[PDB]
Amino acid sequence: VTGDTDQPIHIESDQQSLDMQGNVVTFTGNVIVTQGTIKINADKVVVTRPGGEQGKEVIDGYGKPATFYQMQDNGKPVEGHASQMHYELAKDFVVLTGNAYLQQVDSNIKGDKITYLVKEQKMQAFSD
Template sequence: MKRYKLTTLLCLCLSTASWALSNDTEQPIYIDSDNQELDIQNNVVTFTGNVILRQGSIDIRADKVVVTRPGGQEGKETIDAYGNPATFHQVMDDGKPIDGAAKKMRYETATEFLKMTEEAVLIQEGSEIKGNVISYRIDQQKLVAESGKKQRVTTILQPNQLNNDKK
């Protein structure tokens, strides 16, 4: 019975868009970890130890992933990933991969908001953005990178991407 409740809660918690920029959110989510803990009263599932989350082309690797559904409301999930660093990989609709890493990542499904903090980096086709905090509004395709103490935001653009934008 406990296994049934756990599986049901996981399916409900993870059935909405998470971390996706394409039709990956229509795919099932697979989570492998060394351990998992379920708090039914608070609608929280915690995965620890070599966590691998896969959904379509999305691949997230972390030391710990916490999925929360406030008030049990579907579509309002928050996914927090922690690692040294936590990483993600996804193939975009145009076939180009995007990779990211940070010590903390947070995705809010209701607002399609991704926030990466502490040594955050996004890389696509050799170009990269580094900052203490990188926030991305997926639905609006708006990105903001912020510096930290004694640190600046660094952006490296590859010439081939600049030339492709001119075409």
């Protein structure tokens, strides 16, 4: 949605490593990256800040597959998956690589129980 790329980025994982040379942090274990409605899931996430220059951070997610979600202004979520997510914050786009897939959802529903017909239904009509 509008404003998503102005939000703080939260990255949660089971384990985190700090490269003692600075500017690289690695997350492993059910990593979730959130920025507004943006959500990336991955097994490992590498955050780099080249030269300590904030605003030029790069977030790389790796998974089998990693997954991507965002809500759009028009109400339809966008969902994707790939072996790797590459998000340069300076560029405002995400690159999915490796068996990459992206889709847009136009309808959904939740319940404790949902029935769904797996055979198509035929026109019901009759004359006198």
